[PDB]
Coordinates of C-alpha atoms and ligand atoms in Angstrom, one line a residue:
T1 CA -20.7 8.7 -27.2
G2 CA -18.5 11.3 -25.4
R3 CA -15.3 9.1 -25.0
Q4 CA -13.2 10.7 -27.8
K5 CA -10.5 12.0 -25.4
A6 CA -10.7 8.9 -23.3
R7 CA -10.0 6.4 -26.4
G8 CA -7.2 8.7 -27.5
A9 CA -5.9 9.2 -24.0
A10 CA -5.5 5.3 -23.6
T11 CA -3.9 4.8 -26.9
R12 CA -1.0 7.3 -26.3
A13 CA -0.6 5.6 -22.5
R14 CA -0.2 2.0 -24.1
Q15 CA 2.4 3.3 -26.9
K16 CA 4.4 5.2 -24.5
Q17 CA 4.4 1.9 -22.2
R18 CA 5.2 0.0 -25.2
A19 CA 8.0 2.4 -26.1
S20 CA 9.3 2.3 -22.5
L21 CA 9.4 -1.5 -22.6
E22 CA 10.8 -1.9 -26.0
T23 CA 13.7 0.8 -24.8
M24 CA 14.3 -1.2 -21.7
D25 CA 14.8 -4.5 -23.5
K26 CA 17.0 -3.0 -26.1
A27 CA 19.0 -1.6 -23.3
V28 CA 19.4 -4.9 -21.4
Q29 CA 20.3 -7.0 -24.5
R30 CA 22.9 -4.5 -25.3
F31 CA 24.5 -5.0 -22.0
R32 CA 24.5 -8.7 -22.0
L33 CA 26.3 -9.0 -24.9
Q34 CA 29.4 -7.1 -23.3
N35 CA 28.7 -8.9 -19.8
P36 CA 27.8 -12.6 -20.5
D37 CA 29.7 -14.2 -18.0
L38 CA 28.0 -12.6 -14.9
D39 CA 25.8 -14.2 -12.3
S40 CA 22.6 -12.4 -12.9
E41 CA 20.6 -14.5 -10.5
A42 CA 22.9 -14.6 -7.7
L43 CA 22.7 -10.6 -8.0
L44 CA 18.7 -10.7 -8.3
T45 CA 18.9 -13.1 -5.3
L46 CA 21.0 -10.9 -3.1
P47 CA 19.2 -9.2 -0.2
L48 CA 19.4 -5.3 -0.4
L49 CA 21.6 -4.8 2.5
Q50 CA 24.1 -7.1 0.9
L51 CA 23.7 -5.5 -2.4
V52 CA 24.4 -2.0 -1.0
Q53 CA 27.6 -3.5 0.6
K54 CA 29.0 -4.5 -2.6
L55 CA 27.9 -1.3 -4.3
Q56 CA 29.7 0.8 -1.8
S57 CA 32.7 -1.3 -1.5
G58 CA 32.8 -1.7 -5.3
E59 CA 32.5 -5.4 -5.8
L60 CA 29.6 -4.8 -8.1
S61 CA 29.3 -1.9 -10.6
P62 CA 26.1 0.1 -10.5
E63 CA 25.6 -0.4 -14.3
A64 CA 25.6 -4.4 -13.4
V65 CA 22.8 -4.2 -10.8
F66 CA 21.0 -1.6 -12.9
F67 CA 21.1 -3.7 -16.0
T68 CA 20.5 -7.0 -14.3
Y69 CA 17.3 -5.7 -12.5
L70 CA 16.1 -3.9 -15.4
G71 CA 16.1 -7.0 -17.4
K72 CA 14.3 -9.0 -14.6
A73 CA 11.7 -6.3 -14.3
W74 CA 11.1 -6.4 -18.0
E75 CA 10.7 -10.3 -17.9
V76 CA 8.5 -10.4 -14.8
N77 CA 6.5 -7.7 -16.7
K78 CA 5.3 -10.0 -19.2
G79 CA 3.0 -12.1 -16.9
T80 CA 2.0 -9.0 -14.7
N81 CA 1.4 -5.9 -16.7
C82 CA 3.2 -3.9 -13.8
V83 CA 5.4 -1.3 -15.6
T84 CA 3.8 1.8 -16.8
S85 CA 7.0 3.7 -17.9
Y86 CA 10.6 3.4 -18.0
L87 CA 11.9 6.5 -16.2
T88 CA 14.1 7.9 -19.5
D89 CA 16.8 9.5 -17.8
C90 CA 17.7 6.8 -15.2
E91 CA 20.8 5.7 -17.3
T92 CA 22.3 9.2 -17.0
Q93 CA 21.4 9.2 -13.1
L94 CA 23.2 6.1 -12.7
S95 CA 26.7 7.7 -13.8
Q96 CA 26.3 11.0 -11.8
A97 CA 24.8 9.3 -8.7
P98 CA 25.9 10.8 -5.1
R99 CA 28.7 8.4 -4.4
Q100 CA 28.9 8.2 -0.7
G101 CA 25.1 7.8 -0.3
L102 CA 23.1 5.2 1.7
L103 CA 21.3 3.8 -1.4
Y104 CA 24.3 4.4 -4.0
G105 CA 23.6 2.4 -7.1
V106 CA 20.1 0.8 -6.0
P107 CA 17.5 0.9 -8.4
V108 CA 14.0 1.8 -7.1
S109 CA 10.5 1.2 -8.5
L110 CA 8.0 4.0 -7.9
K111 CA 4.3 4.0 -7.9
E112 CA 2.9 6.2 -10.4
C113 CA 1.5 9.0 -8.5
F114 CA 5.3 10.0 -7.3
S115 CA 5.8 12.8 -9.9
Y116 CA 9.0 12.4 -11.8
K117 CA 10.1 15.1 -14.4
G118 CA 8.9 14.6 -17.8
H119 CA 6.5 11.7 -16.9
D120 CA 2.8 11.6 -16.5
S121 CA 1.5 10.5 -13.3
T122 CA -1.8 9.7 -14.8
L123 CA -3.3 7.8 -11.7
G124 CA -5.3 5.8 -14.4
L125 CA -7.3 8.8 -15.4
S126 CA -7.4 10.4 -19.0
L127 CA -7.5 14.0 -17.4
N128 CA -4.2 13.6 -16.1
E129 CA -2.7 12.3 -19.8
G130 CA -0.2 14.4 -21.6
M131 CA 0.7 16.5 -18.6
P132 CA 4.2 15.7 -17.5
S133 CA 5.6 16.7 -14.0
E134 CA 7.7 19.9 -14.2
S135 CA 9.9 18.3 -11.5
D136 CA 10.6 15.3 -9.1
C137 CA 8.5 15.0 -6.1
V138 CA 10.5 15.8 -2.8
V139 CA 10.9 12.3 -1.9
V140 CA 12.4 11.3 -5.4
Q141 CA 14.9 14.1 -5.1
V142 CA 15.9 12.8 -1.6
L143 CA 15.9 9.4 -3.3
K144 CA 18.3 10.7 -6.0
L145 CA 20.5 12.7 -3.5
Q146 CA 20.8 9.6 -1.4
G147 CA 22.3 7.6 -4.4
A148 CA 19.4 5.8 -5.6
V149 CA 18.3 5.3 -9.4
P150 CA 14.5 5.6 -9.6
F151 CA 13.8 3.5 -13.0
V152 CA 10.2 2.6 -13.5
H153 CA 6.6 3.9 -12.8
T154 CA 4.4 0.8 -11.5
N155 CA 0.8 0.4 -12.3
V156 CA -2.2 1.8 -9.9
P157 CA -6.1 1.3 -10.0
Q158 CA -7.8 4.2 -11.7
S159 CA -7.9 7.0 -9.0
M160 CA -6.1 4.8 -6.3
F161 CA -9.4 4.5 -4.4
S162 CA -9.2 0.7 -4.9
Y163 CA -7.4 -2.5 -3.4
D164 CA -7.4 -4.0 -6.8
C165 CA -5.3 -2.8 -9.6
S166 CA -6.7 -2.1 -13.1
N167 CA -7.3 1.3 -15.1
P168 CA -8.4 1.9 -18.8
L169 CA -4.9 3.5 -19.8
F170 CA -2.6 0.5 -19.1
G171 CA -5.3 -2.3 -18.0
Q172 CA -5.0 -4.7 -15.4
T173 CA -2.1 -5.9 -13.3
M174 CA -2.0 -9.2 -11.9
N175 CA -0.5 -11.3 -9.0
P176 CA 2.7 -12.9 -10.0
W177 CA 2.0 -16.1 -7.9
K178 CA -1.3 -16.7 -9.5
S179 CA -2.6 -14.5 -12.5
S180 CA -6.5 -15.2 -11.5
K181 CA -5.8 -13.1 -8.5
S182 CA -5.4 -9.4 -7.7
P183 CA -1.9 -8.2 -6.8
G184 CA -3.5 -5.8 -4.1
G185 CA -3.7 -2.1 -4.4
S186 CA -3.5 0.8 -4.9
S187 CA 0.2 0.1 -4.9
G188 CA -0.3 -3.2 -6.9
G189 CA 2.4 -2.7 -9.6
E190 CA 4.9 -2.1 -6.7
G191 CA 3.9 -5.5 -5.0
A192 CA 3.6 -7.3 -8.2
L193 CA 7.1 -6.1 -9.3
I194 CA 8.9 -6.4 -6.1
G195 CA 7.1 -9.6 -4.9
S196 CA 8.6 -11.3 -8.3
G197 CA 12.0 -10.0 -8.1
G198 CA 11.5 -7.1 -10.6
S199 CA 12.8 -4.4 -7.9
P200 CA 14.9 -4.6 -4.5
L201 CA 13.1 -1.6 -3.1
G202 CA 10.1 0.7 -4.0
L203 CA 7.7 3.4 -2.7
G204 CA 4.0 3.3 -2.3
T205 CA 1.2 5.4 -0.6
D206 CA -1.5 4.2 1.7
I207 CA -4.8 5.8 2.7
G208 CA -6.9 2.7 3.3
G209 CA -4.5 0.0 3.4
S210 CA -2.6 0.7 -0.1
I211 CA 1.0 -0.2 1.0
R212 CA -0.2 -3.1 3.2
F213 CA -2.6 -4.9 1.0
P214 CA -0.3 -5.4 -2.1
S215 CA 2.7 -6.3 0.5
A216 CA 0.3 -9.0 1.7
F217 CA -1.1 -10.4 -1.6
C218 CA 2.3 -10.5 -3.1
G219 CA 4.0 -11.7 0.0
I220 CA 6.6 -9.0 0.7
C221 CA 7.0 -6.2 3.3
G222 CA 5.6 -2.8 3.7
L223 CA 5.2 0.1 6.2
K224 CA 2.6 2.7 6.3
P225 CA 4.3 5.3 8.7
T226 CA 2.4 8.2 10.5
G227 CA 0.9 10.5 7.8
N228 CA 3.3 13.2 8.1
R229 CA 6.8 11.2 8.9
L230 CA 7.5 11.8 5.3
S231 CA 6.9 14.7 2.7
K232 CA 3.7 14.3 0.6
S233 CA 5.0 17.4 -1.5
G234 CA 4.7 16.4 -5.2
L235 CA 2.6 13.4 -5.0
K236 CA -0.3 13.5 -7.7
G237 CA -3.6 12.8 -6.0
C238 CA -7.6 12.9 -7.0
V239 CA -8.4 15.1 -3.8
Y240 CA -6.5 17.9 -2.1
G241 CA -7.3 19.4 1.3
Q242 CA -9.0 16.4 3.0
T243 CA -7.0 16.1 6.1
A244 CA -9.1 14.0 8.3
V245 CA -8.0 10.7 7.2
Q246 CA -4.7 11.6 6.1
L247 CA -2.7 9.8 3.5
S248 CA 0.6 8.4 4.2
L249 CA 3.5 7.2 2.1
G250 CA 6.2 4.3 2.8
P251 CA 8.5 1.8 1.6
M252 CA 7.8 -1.7 0.1
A253 CA 10.7 -4.1 0.1
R254 CA 11.3 -8.0 0.0
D255 CA 12.6 -7.9 3.8
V256 CA 12.1 -5.7 6.8
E257 CA 15.9 -4.6 6.9
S258 CA 15.4 -3.1 3.5
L259 CA 12.5 -0.9 4.8
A260 CA 14.5 0.3 7.6
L261 CA 17.3 1.1 5.3
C262 CA 15.1 3.0 3.2
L263 CA 13.5 5.3 5.9
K264 CA 17.0 5.8 7.6
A265 CA 18.0 7.0 4.0
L266 CA 15.0 9.4 3.5
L267 CA 14.9 10.9 7.1
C268 CA 17.8 13.2 6.4
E269 CA 18.7 16.9 6.4
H270 CA 17.9 16.7 2.8
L271 CA 14.1 15.9 3.4
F272 CA 13.8 18.4 6.2
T273 CA 15.6 21.1 4.3
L274 CA 13.6 20.7 1.2
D275 CA 10.2 20.1 3.1
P276 CA 10.4 21.9 6.5
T277 CA 6.7 20.9 7.4
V278 CA 7.8 17.5 8.1
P279 CA 9.2 17.3 11.7
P280 CA 12.9 16.8 11.8
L281 CA 12.8 13.4 13.4
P282 CA 15.9 11.3 12.7
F283 CA 15.7 7.6 12.2
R284 CA 16.4 6.2 15.8
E285 CA 18.7 3.1 15.0
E286 CA 18.8 2.3 18.9
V287 CA 15.0 1.5 19.1
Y288 CA 15.1 -0.4 15.6
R289 CA 17.7 -2.7 16.7
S290 CA 16.6 -3.4 20.5
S291 CA 15.9 -6.8 21.8
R292 CA 13.9 -6.0 24.8
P293 CA 10.9 -8.1 25.4
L294 CA 7.6 -6.6 24.1
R295 CA 4.2 -6.3 25.7
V296 CA 2.2 -7.0 22.3
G297 CA -1.4 -6.4 22.0
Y298 CA -3.5 -9.0 19.9
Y299 CA -6.5 -9.9 18.4
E300 CA -7.4 -12.7 15.8
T301 CA -10.5 -10.7 14.5
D302 CA -12.0 -7.3 14.4
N303 CA -15.5 -8.5 14.6
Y304 CA -16.1 -6.8 11.5
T305 CA -14.4 -8.8 8.8
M306 CA -14.1 -12.5 9.4
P307 CA -10.7 -13.6 8.8
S308 CA -9.9 -16.5 6.4
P309 CA -8.3 -19.6 8.1
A310 CA -5.1 -18.6 6.7
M311 CA -5.3 -15.4 8.3
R312 CA -6.4 -16.8 11.7
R313 CA -3.6 -19.5 11.5
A314 CA -1.3 -16.9 10.6
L315 CA -2.3 -14.8 13.5
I316 CA -2.4 -17.5 16.2
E317 CA 1.0 -19.0 15.0
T318 CA 2.6 -15.9 15.2
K319 CA 1.2 -15.0 18.5
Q320 CA 2.6 -18.4 20.0
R321 CA 5.9 -18.0 18.2
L322 CA 6.2 -14.7 20.0
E323 CA 5.3 -16.1 23.4
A324 CA 8.1 -18.6 23.0
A325 CA 10.5 -15.7 22.2
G326 CA 9.4 -14.2 25.7
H327 CA 7.1 -11.4 24.4
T328 CA 3.9 -10.9 26.6
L329 CA 0.9 -11.3 24.3
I330 CA -2.4 -9.3 25.6
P331 CA -5.8 -9.3 24.3
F332 CA -6.6 -5.7 22.8
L333 CA -9.3 -4.5 20.7
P334 CA -10.0 -0.8 19.9
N335 CA -13.5 0.5 20.9
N336 CA -16.1 1.0 18.4
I337 CA -14.5 -0.3 15.2
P338 CA -17.9 0.1 13.0
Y339 CA -17.9 3.8 14.1
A340 CA -14.4 4.5 13.0
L341 CA -15.1 2.8 9.5
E342 CA -18.6 3.4 8.7
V343 CA -18.8 7.1 10.5
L344 CA -15.2 8.3 10.8
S345 CA -13.0 7.0 7.9
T346 CA -15.9 6.9 5.3
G347 CA -17.1 10.4 6.5
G348 CA -13.5 11.6 6.2
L349 CA -12.7 10.4 2.8
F350 CA -16.0 11.5 1.4
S351 CA -17.1 14.4 3.6
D352 CA -18.0 16.4 0.4
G353 CA -20.1 13.3 -0.9
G354 CA -17.6 12.5 -3.9
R355 CA -18.2 15.8 -5.7
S356 CA -14.3 16.4 -5.9
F357 CA -13.4 12.9 -6.5
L358 CA -15.9 12.6 -9.4
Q359 CA -14.7 15.4 -11.4
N360 CA -11.4 13.4 -12.2
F361 CA -14.1 10.9 -13.7
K362 CA -16.1 13.4 -16.1
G363 CA -16.0 12.2 -19.8
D364 CA -13.7 9.1 -18.7
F365 CA -14.1 5.3 -18.7
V366 CA -14.9 3.9 -15.2
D367 CA -12.8 0.8 -14.7
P368 CA -15.1 -2.3 -13.5
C369 CA -12.6 -2.8 -10.4
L370 CA -14.0 0.3 -8.9
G371 CA -17.2 -1.4 -8.4
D372 CA -20.1 0.6 -7.6
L373 CA -18.2 3.5 -5.9
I374 CA -18.5 6.0 -8.9
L375 CA -22.1 5.0 -9.4
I376 CA -22.8 5.3 -5.6
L377 CA -21.2 8.7 -5.3
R378 CA -22.8 9.9 -8.4
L379 CA -26.5 9.2 -6.8
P380 CA -27.8 12.4 -5.3
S381 CA -27.7 12.8 -1.5
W382 CA -31.7 12.7 -0.9
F383 CA -31.4 9.2 -2.6
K384 CA -28.7 8.1 -0.3
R385 CA -30.4 9.0 2.7
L386 CA -33.7 7.5 1.6
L387 CA -31.9 4.2 0.4
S388 CA -29.8 4.0 3.6
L389 CA -33.2 4.3 5.8
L390 CA -34.6 1.3 3.9
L391 CA -31.4 -0.9 3.8
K392 CA -30.4 -0.3 7.6
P393 CA -32.7 -3.0 9.1
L394 CA -31.8 -5.4 6.3
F395 CA -28.1 -4.5 5.6
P396 CA -26.7 -2.0 8.3
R397 CA -23.2 -2.5 7.4
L398 CA -24.2 -1.1 3.7
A399 CA -26.8 1.3 4.9
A400 CA -24.1 2.9 7.3
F401 CA -21.6 3.6 4.6
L402 CA -24.3 5.0 2.3
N403 CA -25.5 7.5 5.1
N404 CA -21.8 8.7 5.5
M405 CA -21.2 9.1 1.9
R406 CA -23.4 12.1 1.8
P407 CA -22.3 15.7 1.4
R408 CA -22.0 17.9 4.7
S409 CA -21.5 21.5 5.8
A410 CA -18.4 22.9 7.1
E411 CA -19.8 22.7 10.6
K412 CA -20.4 19.0 10.4
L413 CA -16.9 18.2 9.3
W414 CA -15.3 20.2 12.0
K415 CA -17.5 17.9 14.3
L416 CA -16.3 14.8 12.4
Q417 CA -12.7 15.9 12.7
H418 CA -13.0 16.5 16.5
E419 CA -14.4 12.8 16.9
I420 CA -11.3 11.5 14.9
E421 CA -8.9 13.5 17.3
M422 CA -10.7 12.1 20.5
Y423 CA -11.1 8.7 18.9
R424 CA -7.2 8.6 18.4
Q425 CA -6.9 9.6 22.1
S426 CA -9.6 7.1 23.2
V427 CA -7.4 4.3 21.7
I428 CA -4.2 5.8 22.8
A429 CA -5.6 5.6 26.5
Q430 CA -6.6 1.9 25.9
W431 CA -3.2 1.2 24.8
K432 CA -1.5 3.0 27.5
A433 CA -3.8 1.3 30.2
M434 CA -2.4 -2.1 29.3
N435 CA 1.1 -0.5 28.8
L436 CA 1.5 -2.3 25.4
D437 CA 4.5 -1.5 23.1
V438 CA 3.1 -2.7 19.8
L439 CA 0.0 -4.5 18.7
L440 CA -0.2 -7.5 16.3
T441 CA -3.1 -7.8 14.0
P442 CA -4.5 -9.8 11.4
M443 CA -4.5 -8.8 7.8
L444 CA -6.4 -9.4 4.8
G445 CA -5.4 -12.2 2.9
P446 CA -4.9 -14.6 0.7
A447 CA -5.0 -12.5 -2.4
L448 CA -8.7 -11.8 -3.6
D449 CA -9.7 -12.8 -7.2
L450 CA -9.7 -10.0 -10.1
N451 CA -12.4 -7.5 -9.9
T452 CA -13.5 -8.6 -6.5
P453 CA -11.9 -6.0 -4.1
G454 CA -14.3 -3.3 -5.5
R455 CA -17.3 -5.1 -4.4
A456 CA -15.9 -6.3 -0.9
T457 CA -15.5 -3.0 0.7
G458 CA -16.0 -4.6 4.4
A459 CA -12.4 -6.0 4.0
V460 CA -10.7 -2.8 4.5
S461 CA -11.5 -2.9 8.1
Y462 CA -8.2 -4.3 9.2
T463 CA -5.9 -1.7 7.4
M464 CA -8.3 1.3 7.5
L465 CA -8.7 1.7 11.0
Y466 CA -4.8 2.7 11.4
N467 CA -5.3 5.4 8.7
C468 CA -8.1 6.7 10.9
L469 CA -6.1 6.5 13.9
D470 CA -2.8 7.5 12.1
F471 CA -0.9 4.8 13.6
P472 CA 2.4 3.6 12.0
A473 CA 1.4 0.2 10.5
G474 CA 3.2 -2.6 8.5
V475 CA 2.8 -6.0 7.2
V476 CA 5.0 -9.3 7.2
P477 CA 4.5 -12.4 5.4
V478 CA 4.3 -15.2 7.9
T479 CA 2.9 -18.2 6.0
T480 CA 1.4 -19.8 2.8
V481 CA -2.1 -21.0 2.3
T482 CA -2.5 -24.8 2.9
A483 CA -5.1 -26.8 1.2
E484 CA -6.4 -27.5 4.7
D485 CA -7.0 -23.7 5.0
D486 CA -8.7 -23.4 1.4
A487 CA -11.0 -26.1 2.2
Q488 CA -12.0 -24.4 5.5
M489 CA -13.1 -21.7 3.4
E490 CA -16.3 -23.1 2.3
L491 CA -17.4 -23.1 6.0
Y492 CA -16.8 -19.2 6.0
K493 CA -20.0 -17.4 6.7
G494 CA -18.9 -13.9 7.7
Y495 CA -20.2 -11.6 10.7
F496 CA -22.9 -10.0 8.5
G497 CA -23.9 -12.2 5.5
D498 CA -24.4 -9.1 3.2
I499 CA -22.9 -9.1 0.0
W500 CA -19.4 -8.0 0.7
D501 CA -19.2 -11.1 3.0
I502 CA -20.5 -13.1 0.1
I503 CA -18.0 -11.7 -2.7
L504 CA -15.0 -12.0 -0.3
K505 CA -16.0 -15.5 0.5
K506 CA -15.7 -16.7 -3.2
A507 CA -12.8 -14.2 -3.9
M508 CA -10.4 -15.7 -1.3
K509 CA -11.1 -19.3 -2.6
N510 CA -8.5 -21.2 -4.8
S511 CA -5.8 -19.7 -3.1
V512 CA -3.5 -22.6 -2.1
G513 CA 0.2 -21.7 -1.9
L514 CA -0.4 -18.0 -1.8
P515 CA 1.0 -16.0 1.0
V516 CA -0.6 -14.7 4.0
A517 CA 0.7 -12.0 6.4
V518 CA 0.2 -10.3 9.7
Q519 CA -0.1 -6.8 10.6
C520 CA 2.0 -5.0 13.1
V521 CA 1.1 -1.5 14.7
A522 CA 2.7 1.2 17.1
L523 CA 2.0 4.4 18.5
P524 CA 2.3 7.6 16.3
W525 CA 6.1 8.6 15.5
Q526 CA 7.1 5.0 16.4
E527 CA 8.0 3.9 13.1
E528 CA 11.4 2.4 14.4
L529 CA 9.6 0.6 16.9
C530 CA 7.2 -0.9 14.4
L531 CA 10.1 -2.1 12.3
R532 CA 11.8 -3.7 15.3
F533 CA 8.6 -5.7 15.9
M534 CA 8.1 -6.3 12.2
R535 CA 11.7 -7.7 12.1
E536 CA 10.9 -9.9 14.9
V537 CA 7.9 -11.4 13.4
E538 CA 10.1 -11.8 10.3
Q539 CA 13.1 -13.8 12.2
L540 CA 10.5 -16.1 14.1
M541 CA 8.2 -17.0 10.9
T542 CA 11.0 -17.8 8.3
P543 CA 11.0 -21.4 7.0
Ligands
JXV601 O1 -18.5 -0.6 -2.1 C1 -19.0 0.5 -1.4 C2 -18.4 1.6 -2.3 N1 -17.0 1.9 -2.3 C3 -16.3 2.3 -1.3 C4 -15.1 2.3 -1.2 C5 -14.3 2.7 0.0 C6 -12.8 2.7 -0.1 C7 -12.1 3.8 0.6 C8 -10.7 3.8 0.8 C9 -9.9 2.8 0.0 C10 -10.5 1.8 -0.6 C11 -11.8 1.7 -0.6 O2 -9.7 1.0 -1.5 C12 -8.5 0.6 -0.9 C13 -7.7 1.9 -0.6 O3 -8.5 2.7 0.0 N2 -14.9 3.2 1.0 C14 -16.1 3.4 1.2 N3 -16.8 2.9 0.0 C15 -20.4 0.4 -1.4 C16 -21.0 1.3 -0.6 C17 -22.5 1.4 -0.2 C18 -23.2 0.3 -1.0 C19 -22.6 -0.6 -1.9 C20 -21.2 -0.5 -1.9

């Protein structure tokens, strides 16, 4: 009965969305009258490096590449529901774009949390509706300064604490390969859009896998750098001052070269001048372009989330293809993964028991795809500890998350923050002892059914670990689900048998033809190495 403002918020958001799309369309069709004989699917097809080349040499005009992609985005949006807003003024930015910039005339999609002047960054929440950004976030300024034309705000799951992608304002985003499936999240609108040719390049945030999931589920590249490689200034979030598990932002694109282009474009003196709290580490092209044989750690499971057959096959086929290229593959597994997930990561994100998070939800509709998170955090802490002590014998994995989602005293979070530092060094010591360069990893895939990710929390294990360690981690699509793999899904039993295993069992069925990826990891500040290795995987696993 107190959803007055929630119902009103949503109505405004949908008309703002509808007006954006209607504006986008009447823009595109104006253009197509004056540009009929023009090779739009050669343009949309063109890889980004190609595209910048023609924009810089002046073979294609910026308006052509803008209004061609603008049309395509609008078309793919009809199946997917992945464009929140059309960024108003981008037509004006196109004409006054910095001409010798590294992304001159490249149109760029932005996850909604990236502040853009005059536009809401709602995060699917009614409390953030009707509250336009006073100015562009630091990375958007650098984008615009480097010649790019940010043009849409792509959708996110309510609060971004979910690897599905629905909210009560703009509704549910769907996977462009199969509309019964989730596109991933929280950068789901990004993946859906880029993954269907709606944008050559875009920007996401990751805190539990939120770049890597949608990249994998929608079959594109994506990199989560080290937390403070790039400027978090101006990004809209649920919680501020949680530093233990640090959020990280990075690129999402159709290929690995695009990603390396994009970092090289942002890591410049503009970024470091505009935000001196970021360490002025220039993009080292020498390391990215190296062809030195790699010592590559690997594991085909984390013993926590049982991989799908597709994942397992993707991991082994890459492992072996890499061996044939001459890289040295070494079995490697970080110590105490259950501890990192159940105690450290979970404790880090909900150190305060959720009370900060939850005030975003007061008087709002709770999206079904958040599952039982809001209800669980809303429970009082004595009931969490009691209920944990009952479940532990029967369901340790679930009892352990519950035990570490209670509020704690400043003394206890100092102790947790120390264990994270020590754990990070603990895994670095494993790494250095086996002299590895990079680390090959499975990656959750194929894409889950809709409203499944919310009730399959174990499956964050593959990605979350490296938010916890704060290692640069990216994904590359390597293969597509065979019927042989989809059939092998009915022998899937999981390592625990609790409901997260059961939900994801069914969630991952009926996924023939969907893409499946692997994860690449490096030590901190070695983003350029992570991309060298991702690029290697990309070359060796193309069909
Ligand atoms: O389902 C859970 C409650 N939900 C969560 C969710 C997440 C979570 C954290 C980071 C994420 C994310 C999800 O989504 C992707 C991006 O980042 N972490 C811990 N708990 C549960 C617990 C006890 C009993 C029953 C059910």
